[PDB]
Enzyme design. Structure first.
Site, PDB file in Angstrom:
ATOM      1  N   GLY A  15      16.419  44.288  35.309  1.00 44.07           N
ATOM      2  CA  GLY A  15      15.950  43.313  36.514  1.00 44.07           C
ATOM      3  C   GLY A  15      14.983  42.183  36.280  1.00 44.07           C
ATOM      4  N   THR A  18       8.120  38.713  37.741  1.00 43.89           N
ATOM      5  CA  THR A  18       7.598  37.147  37.602  1.00 43.89           C
ATOM      6  C   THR A  18       7.595  36.470  36.320  1.00 43.89           C
ATOM      7  OG1 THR A  18       5.836  38.247  39.151  1.00 43.89           O
ATOM      8  CG2 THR A  18       4.909  36.335  37.931  1.00 43.89           C
ATOM      9  N   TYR A  19       7.989  37.260  35.386  1.00 43.21           N
ATOM     10  CA  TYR A  19       8.491  36.387  33.986  1.00 43.21           C
ATOM     11  C   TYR A  19       9.679  36.566  33.786  1.00 43.21           C
ATOM     12  CZ  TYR A  19       3.456  37.188  34.063  1.00 43.21           C
ATOM     13  OH  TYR A  19       2.196  37.270  34.528  1.00 43.21           O
ATOM     14  N   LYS A  37       9.181  42.916  28.073  1.00 37.78           N
ATOM     15  CA  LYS A  37       8.933  41.556  28.784  1.00 37.78           C
ATOM     16  C   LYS A  37       8.913  40.299  27.863  1.00 37.78           C
ATOM     17  CE  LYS A  37       7.241  42.297  32.528  1.00 37.78           C
ATOM     18  NZ  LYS A  37       6.162  42.491  33.744  1.00 37.78           N
ATOM     19  N   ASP A 125      -0.607  40.257  43.989  1.00 39.82           N
ATOM     20  CA  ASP A 125       0.750  39.718  44.066  1.00 39.82           C
ATOM     21  C   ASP A 125       1.525  41.263  44.512  1.00 39.82           C
ATOM     22  OD1 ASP A 125       3.295  38.555  44.882  1.00 39.82           O
ATOM     23  OD2 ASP A 125       3.862  38.515  42.718  1.00 39.82           O
ATOM     24  N   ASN A 130       7.320  45.311  42.737  1.00 40.38           N
ATOM     25  CA  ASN A 130       6.232  45.291  41.600  1.00 40.38           C
ATOM     26  C   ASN A 130       5.838  46.646  41.392  1.00 40.38           C
ATOM     27  OD1 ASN A 130       4.839  42.107  42.161  1.00 40.38           O
ATOM     28  ND2 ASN A 130       6.655  42.512  41.303  1.00 40.38           N
ATOM     29  N   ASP A 143       3.376  43.861  37.176  1.00 36.28           N
ATOM     30  CA  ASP A 143       3.608  42.284  37.577  1.00 36.28           C
ATOM     31  C   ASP A 143       2.531  41.945  38.406  1.00 36.28           C
ATOM     32  OD1 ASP A 143       5.695  41.141  36.233  1.00 36.28           O
ATOM     33  OD2 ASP A 143       7.086  41.390  37.814  1.00 36.28           O
TER      34      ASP A 143
HETATM   35  O1  LIG Z   1       3.127  42.333  32.857  1.00 37.15           O
HETATM   36  S1  LIG Z   1       2.419  43.143  33.808  1.00 37.15           S
HETATM   37  O2  LIG Z   1       3.223  44.130  34.551  1.00 37.15           O
HETATM   38  O3  LIG Z   1       1.720  42.259  34.942  1.00 37.15           O
HETATM   39  C1  LIG Z   1       1.066  44.087  32.798  1.00 37.15           C
HETATM   40  C2  LIG Z   1       1.077  45.423  33.242  1.00 37.15           C
HETATM   41  C3  LIG Z   1       0.099  46.295  32.897  1.00 37.15           C
HETATM   42  C4  LIG Z   1      -0.663  45.949  31.760  1.00 37.15           C
HETATM   43  C5  LIG Z   1      -0.714  44.391  31.288  1.00 37.15           C
HETATM   44  C6  LIG Z   1      -1.581  44.116  30.373  1.00 37.15           C
HETATM   45  C7  LIG Z   1      -1.531  42.706  30.000  1.00 37.15           C
HETATM   46  C8  LIG Z   1      -0.788  41.912  30.593  1.00 37.15           C
HETATM   47  C9  LIG Z   1       0.116  42.153  31.667  1.00 37.15           C
HETATM   48  N1  LIG Z   1       1.112  41.198  31.881  1.00 37.15           N
HETATM   49  C10 LIG Z   1       0.934  39.787  31.678  1.00 37.15           C
HETATM   50  C11 LIG Z   1       1.981  39.157  31.339  1.00 37.15           C
HETATM   51  C12 LIG Z   1       1.880  37.612  31.402  1.00 37.15           C
HETATM   52  C13 LIG Z   1       0.711  36.880  31.491  1.00 37.15           C
HETATM   53 CL1  LIG Z   1       0.849  35.364  31.251  1.00 37.15          CL
HETATM   54  C14 LIG Z   1      -0.231  37.585  31.998  1.00 37.15           C
HETATM   55  C15 LIG Z   1      -0.334  39.060  32.204  1.00 37.15           C
HETATM   56  C16 LIG Z   1       0.250  43.483  32.009  1.00 37.15           C
END
Ligand SMILES: O=S(=O)(O)c1cccc2cccc(Nc3ccc(Cl)cc3)c12
Ligand SMILES: O=S(=O)(O)c1cccc2cccc(Nc3ccc(Cl)cc3)c12
EC number: 2.7.11.22
Length: 290
Positions: A15, A18-19, A37, A125, A130, A143
């Site tokens: 899927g 956000t990234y 991701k 969000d 999510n 996310d």
């Molecule tokens: O992807 S997440 O599902 O949001 C996520 C889920 C659980 C722990 C996370 C720990 C650290 C960063 C995460 N994500 C993230 C991705 C890109 C940026 Cl720029 C900032 C944050 C984490």
């Protein structure tokens, strides 16, 4: 250790997010399936918020297993999950998610949010897509919205509007943890009715859909609302609708909780910690989804 991207075999795209694309992958060394991701590459406040999120270890937060740096790329290695609440609601549209599962998911999400909020972490969000679910009945936050919230220079949609708290739409600079309770309240209503509560198509339309259902707020209901940056006295004045119409299947315990989660005033909106003690959760169990 270290892991390298070559150690992982892509299986399938599971899927977007956000990234962008999230992939199911397999560790060639261990056989473990994971979710990957890719982040294409930061403000000081942003590094600090990322560190805060990395610190979190909780059953209702998707587990980050590893972070692999290669040149312009960051590869986040998560536990493998591949169902989410939006996909589950769509597959359950004919019948609806059973109430014991609604209760269990809402309870767990409040547990995860209570934990984040006590560690000074907001999601910002929350939406059904999510929220990841596994075979054993868990539901997990994912996310987090911190890239767009803290101006992270990373590549990152009207669906986001549907769950946005009204203090954000009205321009409040220093919002609070209450924005997450609003979003979750909208998701609660959506699980029950099988339709999104406020599916707007712009910030002003989102506001007007909220007002038409909960009533146009005034100073009695929400002290300070008429001085918020984007408040306009030209807003139409709608009267509040009965929850017997807005969320027909709920009883008084459900309507009580939902009304506290959708309180206009963020200072009166129920906290995650307090909602866990609500009578609605007296009989909460941990069912498994089908
Ligand atoms: O992807 S997440 O599902 O949001 C996520 C889920 C659980 C722990 C996370 C720990 C650290 C960063 C995460 N994500 C993230 C991705 C890109 C940026 Cl720029 C900032 C944050 C984490
Ligand atoms: O701290 S990290 O564990 O790397 C990290 C984990 C998860 C999401 C991240 C999103 C954006 C930046 C991150 N950090 C970072 C630090 C230094 C460099 Cl040179 C490159 C990236 C993220």
């Amino acid at each position: 250790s270290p892991e390298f991207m070559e150690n992982f075999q892509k299986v399938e795209k599971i899927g977007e997010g956000t990234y962008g694309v999230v992939y199911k992958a397999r560790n060639k060394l261990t056989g473990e399936v994971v979710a990957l991701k890719k982040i294409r590459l930061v403000p000081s406040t942003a590094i600090r918020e990322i560190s805060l999120l990395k610190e979190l270890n909780h059953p209702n937060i998707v587990k980050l297993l590893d972070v692999i740096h290669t040149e312009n790329k960051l590869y986040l290695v998560f536990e493998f999950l591949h169902q989410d609440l939006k996909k589950f609601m769509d597959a359950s549209a004919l019948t609806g998610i059973p109430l014991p599962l609604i209760k269990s998911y809402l309870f767990q999400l409040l547990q995860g949010l209570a934990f984040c909020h006590s560690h000074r972490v907001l999601h910002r969000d929350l939406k059904p897509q999510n929220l990841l679910i596994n075979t054993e009945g868990a539901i997990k936050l994912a996310d987090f919205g911190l890239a767009r919230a803290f101006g992270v220079p990373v590549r990152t949609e009207v669906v986001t509007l549907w769950y946005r708290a009204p203090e954000i739409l009205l321009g409040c600079k220093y919002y609070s943890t209450a924005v997450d309770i609003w979003s979750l309240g909208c998701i609660f209503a959506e699980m029950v009715t099988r339709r999104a509560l406020f599916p707007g198509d712009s910030e002003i339309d989102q506001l007007f859909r909220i007002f038409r259902t909960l009533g146009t707020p005034d100073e009695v209901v929400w002290p300070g609302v008429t001085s918020m940056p984007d408040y306009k006295p030209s807003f139409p004045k709608w009267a509040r609708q009965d929850f017997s119409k807005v969320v027909p299947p709920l009883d008084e315990d459900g309507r009580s909780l939902l009304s506290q989660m959708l309180h206009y005033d963020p200072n009166k909106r129920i906290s995650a910690k307090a909602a866990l003690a609500h009578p609605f959760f007296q009989d909460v169990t941990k069912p498994v989804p089908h």
